[PDB]
């Protein structure tokens, strides 16, 4: 059983592109090869890490379940969850964002140190995706996150990396000079993944508990 992604790539579908989610809803498939990676495949420009490896892991998935790993209206009381929208990810003429990611911003002039962990209790491999914002100028960095020494740390038993977003003025792609780089890992049943940051974190919203056999 295939997946039939249509005009959408794997990166767009798994991230929750507003133009993609309108046609996909399966559980037990076997084929996924529909559209290769495009520089316009994600609604916000950026690099998708280990893309070809993710294509192999999602091959012949026997069980698929999308679940809210971090509730939007309950996980980030000291941050704004409503302003993370952008014209590059427009839906029906209004600025939107990824259906599975959450762009956190400052609240009341502060971006407090956030620390959010999640214990895998689904008895399946949980695919967790997130992003890191690389702004186009220091003004945007100060406006959205206040701090200029921003770090994002993501630690689990299989994954451990400290990201330091760099301010880079890049060629205009999809009306964006900045970028969000996308990362992912496979959380083991019973393992804990910890997200810590003081800015630039595109936090996970929905994750995927899957099985390939």
């Amino acid at each position: 059983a295939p997946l039939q992604l249509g005009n959408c790539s794997i990166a767009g579908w798994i991230l929750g592109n507003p133009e993609c989610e309108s046609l996909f809803s399966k559980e037990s498939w076997s084929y996924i090869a529909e559209t290769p990676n495009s520089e316009n495949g994600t609604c916000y420009p950026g690099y998708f890490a280990d893309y070809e490896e993710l294509r192999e892991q999602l091959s012949s998935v026997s069980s698929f379940e999308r679940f809210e790993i971090f509730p939007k209206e309950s996980s980030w009381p000291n941050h704004t969850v409503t302003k993370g929208v952008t014209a590059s990810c427009s839906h029906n003429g209004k600025s939107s964002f990824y259906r599975n990611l959450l762009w956190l911003t400052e609240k009341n002039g502060l971006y407090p140190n956030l620390s959010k962990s999640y214990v895998n209790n689904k008895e399946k491999e949980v695919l967790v995706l997130w992003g890191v914002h690389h702004p186009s100028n220091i003004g945007d960095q100060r406006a959205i996150y206040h701090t200029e020494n921003a770090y994002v740390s993501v630690v689990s038993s299989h994954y451990s990396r400290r990201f330091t977003p760099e301010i880079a003025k890049r060629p205009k792609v999809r009306d964006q000079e900045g970028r969000i780089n996308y990362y992912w890992t496979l959380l083991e049943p019973g393992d804990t993944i910890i997200f810590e940051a003081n800015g630039n974190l595109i936090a996970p919203w929905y994750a995927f508990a899957l099985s390939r056999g």
Partner: antibody
Amino acid sequence: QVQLVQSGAEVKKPGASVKVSCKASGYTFTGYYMHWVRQAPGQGLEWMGWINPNSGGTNYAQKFQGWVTMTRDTSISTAYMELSRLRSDDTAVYYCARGGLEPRSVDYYYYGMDVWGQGTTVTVSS
Amino acid sequence: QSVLTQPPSVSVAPGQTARITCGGNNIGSKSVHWYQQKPGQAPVLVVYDDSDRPSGIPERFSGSNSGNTATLTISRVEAGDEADYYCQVWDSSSDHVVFGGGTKLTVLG
């Protein structure tokens, strides 16, 4: 009733310093940026910079950096503006304004000014 | 700091429609705010977020923002509308708040 009330008019000799005050009421002082704008007689508005009352952080305009210092007293909800080494061109009205307009997207994450103070006239003459 | 270009003066007969433009680089992708300043008084916000009005401002004041020009429209101008009008946008590339040069609206009564 959001209101900003500034200190009275001042006269100063060239080379002196003056500290203008801007009292805020009707909202939480630390929840919004406080801007400062200068207008010379018959001239346009000139942005001088803003201060974050919550953290104390500042962002000065290039033209006013150096001889201009912004502070705030959270206990009394009052954001200060000190001018250094005044000259005759500094004769102007000085307003404070609150960044109460909420941004809608990260594409333009900027709190626009809504409520202005009445203005403080500073006259510099020898 | 990126520049905002306003016409210095605009004249209009009473009851007609006054239009004040604010030109800027890619201003259509930013939320323009307009301020009204009468002689001897502090500025007053009349239009925010391109085309929205605060409570107390009559519906005669309107706004638009597309491309490289933002427009502040005043329909059925009255004598009391004589003031200086300023646009304001934030320039992310400099982290500077920028004011337009200011437009003096004279109603020819």
